[PDB]
Design a protein around this motif. Sequence first.
Motif, PDB file in Angstrom:
ATOM      1  N   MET A 203       0.826  -1.198   0.000  1.00 46.31           N
ATOM      2  CA  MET A 203       0.000   0.000   0.000  1.00 46.31           C
ATOM      3  C   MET A 203       0.864   1.253   0.000  1.00 46.31           C
ATOM      4  SD  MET A 203      -2.986  -1.042   2.724  1.00 46.31           S
ATOM      5  CE  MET A 203      -3.940   0.483   2.468  1.00 46.31           C
TER       6      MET A 203
ATOM      7  N   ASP B 200       2.672   3.674  -2.890  1.00 42.36           N
ATOM      8  CA  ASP B 200       2.049   4.904  -3.375  1.00 42.36           C
ATOM      9  C   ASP B 200       2.586   6.002  -2.458  1.00 42.36           C
ATOM     10  OD1 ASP B 200       0.357   7.157  -3.701  1.00 42.36           O
ATOM     11  OD2 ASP B 200      -1.301   5.875  -4.348  1.00 42.36           O
TER      12      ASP B 200
ATOM     13  N   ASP C  71       1.781   8.949  -1.852  1.00 46.03           N
ATOM     14  CA  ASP C  71       0.786   9.728  -1.116  1.00 46.03           C
ATOM     15  C   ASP C  71       0.092   8.973   0.018  1.00 46.03           C
ATOM     16  OD1 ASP C  71       0.890  12.281  -2.655  1.00 46.03           O
ATOM     17  OD2 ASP C  71       0.216  10.998  -4.303  1.00 46.03           O
ATOM     18  N   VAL C  72       0.477   7.717   0.221  1.00 44.86           N
ATOM     19  CA  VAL C  72      -0.105   6.894   1.279  1.00 44.86           C
ATOM     20  C   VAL C  72       0.897   6.735   2.419  1.00 44.86           C
ATOM     21  CG1 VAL C  72      -1.004   4.638   1.882  1.00 44.86           C
ATOM     22  CG2 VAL C  72      -1.544   5.637  -0.338  1.00 44.86           C
TER      23      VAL C  72
ATOM     24  N   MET D 236      -0.366   7.065   6.034  1.00 42.57           N
ATOM     25  CA  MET D 236      -1.058   6.608   7.231  1.00 42.57           C
ATOM     26  C   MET D 236      -2.180   5.658   6.851  1.00 42.57           C
ATOM     27  SD  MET D 236      -1.058  10.290   9.160  1.00 42.57           S
ATOM     28  CE  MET D 236      -1.420   9.615  10.727  1.00 42.57           C
ATOM     29  N   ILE D 237      -2.085   4.452   7.393  1.00 44.35           N
ATOM     30  CA  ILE D 237      -3.027   3.385   7.111  1.00 44.35           C
ATOM     31  C   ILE D 237      -3.603   2.824   8.403  1.00 44.35           C
ATOM     32  CG2 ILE D 237      -3.304   1.156   6.009  1.00 44.35           C
ATOM     33  CD1 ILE D 237      -0.660   1.819   4.448  1.00 44.35           C
ATOM     34  N   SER D 238      -4.925   2.692   8.449  1.00 40.05           N
ATOM     35  CA  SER D 238      -5.606   2.161   9.620  1.00 40.05           C
ATOM     36  C   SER D 238      -5.160   0.724   9.823  1.00 40.05           C
ATOM     37  CB  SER D 238      -7.121   2.204   9.422  1.00 40.05           C
ATOM     38  OG  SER D 238      -7.520   1.290   8.410  1.00 40.05           O
TER      39      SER D 238
ATOM     40  N   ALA E 171      -7.269  -1.806   7.652  1.00 40.51           N
ATOM     41  CA  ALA E 171      -7.172  -1.889   6.193  1.00 40.51           C
ATOM     42  C   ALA E 171      -6.439  -3.136   5.686  1.00 40.51           C
ATOM     43  CB  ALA E 171      -6.524  -0.613   5.628  1.00 40.51           C
TER      44      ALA E 171
END
Lengths: 78, 87
Positions: free
Chosen positions: A10, A13, A15-16, A18-20, A23
């Motif tokens: 993930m 990318d 621009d990614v 912070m991921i919960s 997810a």
Amino acid sequence: LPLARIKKIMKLDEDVKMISAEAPVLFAKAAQIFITELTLRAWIHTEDNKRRTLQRNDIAMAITKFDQFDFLIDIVPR
Amino acid sequence: IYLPIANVARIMKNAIPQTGKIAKDAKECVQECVSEFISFITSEASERCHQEKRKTINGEDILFAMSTLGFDSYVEPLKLYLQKFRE
């Protein structure tokens, strides 16, 4: 499936950042569903050719027959 | 970056006849497709997250993306899976 690897994918990318926590869990199950449907569909062409070995060209063919796989057309072209 | 080939191959094998075989190149192809799938959904989920004035992409963002991008059939199964995972 290892969740750390999913998170790493993930984050490819830029621009990614912070991921919960939830997810990657959703993607672990989604990946299983996706791999299964993609494989099943590729195998349709493997069988149509009376072969016993699933090949990349079978996957490329399957991609052109399912709208859900439109995003893969240029990734695995016929 | 890809999911472990062994994990991918195991799921692939369960979807074909017991005596069916899979070329190494085909396993690698599916590996490529899976990462593309995750990236495709994540990109849309990131946009949704941003539009909702947030910064951490959450489960609702992922499910919204799946429904928006043509994978709505994944939603209910995913919700059940996550519920069981956290219960």
